[PDB]
Design a protein around this ligand. Structure first.
Ligand SMILES: *Cc1c(COP(=O)(O)O)cnc(C)c1O
Ligand SMILES: *Cc1c(COP(=O)(O)O)cnc(C)c1O
Ligand SMILES: [Sm+3]
Ligand SMILES: [Sm+3]
Ligand SMILES: [Sm+3]
Ligand SMILES: [Sm+3]
Ligand SMILES: [Sm+3]
Ligand SMILES: [Sm+3]
Ligand SMILES: [Sm+3]
Lengths: 423, 420
């Protein structure tokens, strides 16, 4: 079944504007890999969880900044994130968190049983999504957010260090950061831990990621040991080789061709009546169309066998390829598919406050009576279909008000049934 | 450098007798895959963490037994082991363990902070490794051991269920079990959880495994949820595709040719003067040569560009290919290489006792009552006899001192001290 669908997508010549960043083997040099290289810890090849030969030499090549050591991840940024946070489990204090931390961070606090606390987290006026925080054993921040928006993370990092708190930057969507024309990575701002999902925006295979640890960061050794707990003992050499290939691609990339093709794409879309929101990251294209939803726009592109990354009620997200001179991306077919598209005629508040998290039988309780209690299931308003209140939080006056405001306006709200909340 | 090595292995026609089970893409049908198919949760493809379409349908085809639901694992059997154990964390009692449990089991107790206890575990007179247990919220057993040795596991599972204890069976080396002429899987013995590393002995890609959860098993929905915690949010469709392929390979496999080719290889090996230990699983071949070590053997084989799985002092282990009529394996070259090899002329009592585990340098003589902080690993055979988190006893000290008395290399020991 899976193979049958994958073959069918191949025959329809599907065009990727989605993860991973090799774009159905059109961007990058992964054509140099082959499955015959899917091997194991035989002498001559090294051992990821004990690297002292060809993998360590490769690790020295994945380096982007001289204050950091890099480590290969085969179980995604997820595994980096589990390994950094687990190392704090026996230390006093709690873990501070933006409201747009990835679920992996909440999974880490749950399985390790650690106290948490959400930082005041604010909404973009552009994207309607979380995009910045305002200020105790660790801080976790997402940078960029999913939609490629940045904020003054450097200053936050400095501020937290003056209080002696280390920071973990979830840089899942900033693996391409540092290339000419793009935003800067947090590797430049003395972040203690920075995990990047190579596979999401670079030509690495799905699941490939890298954890960068600052050479002075707390619990370095423990963290390195947990990477060998949270990743299989049988790590993939295909994935590892793709990290290596993708790192070489990052090292020698020239972006001039990208910025030209990007301009052409926007031209083409705009002449079709689409409206794009320019975020800080040029790789992330947000497409709107007056009178219609992102899901509608997602569907329209799919009907042309072009596959976007995701959508919300407001807009759809294209993650652009890292186009280069020798790529096999179907650029002309992309632009030609957009031109001939037949579109219709055109027509037509997140929780920001701080909060405690506890890593904790359940029951539905009336909102009015749920105050002071621990939430047992996420509240997810549509739009934007991401959580405003996570399970583990203590329910407040303010939360109930905003949640009733949602319901009064007829906004779909998951984690609520019959005007009750799970506790 | 990683690629350069991988390429030079291909340029020297490396012959695999190691994991994974596609054997340098000579065994199986993974030539139907392409890295063009390395995609994501776009519409049409499903979602491994919330499967209700193509991946759910594929799970149904992964079924080996109607009493179980199979779940794809892209982070190995490891992720499966972590998911099962985590679910018992808030429940009272300890996790009972064979002394040859894999490191992920101890990792799991450590991350989840659960009490453990080791079961009496015996040493094989054949392999001199741990091969069998002798009899409380959960029991974790390894079946088969990685040398392909089995034991009366059915009988142990029945005794435990009568004491109302569920069992997790680490079947990492039993993915090919149930095939004609091979031992049977614990899926037949009502085991509550069975984890199989498809990639190790079937033609699936490295990292691809399957967790089978009995439909009555304790904490089913919690375990299924934790699968989405311990695995990446971006699971590889290549790996999933490879498990789907490996399943179809299992179900359609005819092993008549395997046993013919196995016998011809043993014939060839015997004629060179190698001594082969016959273990319960036909897929595992244990090679000896009188006067020399398993390491020596592995070297001699590497010099012929034949790669064995691993070795200890006693023996070198070969994991055989699941040969078939349309495979592309270099069988003649293997025999040729063995034939014309130029070989020289011919020329550890493990701790079996039960013991408690706590998820938490001292003279060995003064160590009784302290909790071990680093594994004690005798060479040979180079696997732990006493694990970090165990309480040191008079008998452990006696045993370990006799190790040292006799010139046996012991890791975890420095200046006759142990780490506490
Ligand atoms: C995808 C993602 C992750 C997780 O990385 P994987 O490589 O999918 O494990 C973490 N944080 C954010 C913001 C992500 O988008
Ligand atoms: C390899 C192995 C594992 C782990 O499985 P992976 O697929 O490598 O994660 C667990 N138990 C035993 C006995 C093993 O040999
Ligand atoms: Sm607190
Ligand atoms: Sm404020
Ligand atoms: Sm207008
Ligand atoms: Sm000859
Ligand atoms: Sm005594
Ligand atoms: Sm005694
Ligand atoms: Sm003596």
């Amino acid at each position: 079944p899976i193979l049958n669908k994958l073959e069918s997508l191949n025959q329809e010549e599907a065009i990727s504007l989605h993860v991973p960043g090799h774009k159905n083997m059109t961007i990058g040099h992964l054509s140099q890999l082959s499955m015959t290289m899917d091997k194991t810890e035989i002498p001559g090849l090294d051992d990821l969880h004990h690297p002292e030969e060809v993998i360590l030499k490769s690790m020295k090549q994945v380096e982007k900044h001289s204050d950091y050591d890099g480590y290969f991840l085969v179980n995604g940024t997820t595994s980096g994130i589990l390994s950094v946070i687990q190392s704090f489990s026996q230390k006093k204090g709690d873990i501070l968190m933006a409201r747009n931390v990835h679920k992996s961070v909440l999974h880490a606090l749950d399985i390790s049983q650690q106290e948490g606390h959400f930082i005041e987290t604010h909404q973009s006026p552009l994207t309607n999504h979380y995009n910045k925080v305002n200020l105790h054993k660790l801080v976790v921040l997402t940078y960029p957010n999913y939609y490629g928006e940045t904020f003054n993370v450097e200053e936050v990092i400095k501020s937290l260090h003056q209080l002696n708190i280390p920071v973990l930057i979830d840089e899942a969507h900033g693996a391409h950061f540092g290339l000419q024309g793009f935003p800067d990575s947090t590797l430049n701002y003395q972040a203690d831990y920075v995990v990047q999902s190579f596979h999401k925006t670079l030509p690495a295979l799905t699941m490939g990621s890298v954890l960068y640890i600052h050479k002075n960061a707390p619990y370095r050794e423990n963290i390195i040991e947990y990477l060998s707990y949270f990743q299989t003992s049988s790590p993939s050499y295909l994935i590892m080789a793709s990290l290596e290939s993708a790192a070489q691609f990052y090292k020698t990339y020239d972006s001039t061709l990208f910025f030209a093709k990007r301009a052409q794409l926007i031209e083409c879309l705009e002449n079709k009546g689409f409206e794009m929101l320019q975020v800080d990251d040029p790789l992330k294209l947000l497409i709107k169309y007056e009178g219609f939803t992102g899901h509608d726009i997602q569907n329209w592109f799919m009907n042309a066998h072009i596959y976007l990354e995701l959508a919300d009620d407001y807009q759809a997200l294209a993650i652009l390829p890292l186009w280069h001179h020798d790529d096999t991306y179907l650029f002309d077919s992309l632009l030609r598919k957009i031109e001939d598209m037949i579109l219709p005629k055109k027509s037509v508040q997140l929780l920001t406050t701080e909060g405690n998290y506890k890593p904790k039988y359940v029951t539905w309780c009336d909102l009015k009576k749920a105050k002071g209690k621990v939430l047992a299931r996420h509240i997810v308003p549509y739009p934007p279909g991401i959580p405003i209140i996570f399970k583990g939080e203590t329910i407040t006056e303010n939360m109930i008000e905003l949640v009733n405001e949602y319901l009064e306006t007829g906004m779909i709200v998951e984690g609520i049934k019959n005007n009750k909340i799970l506790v």
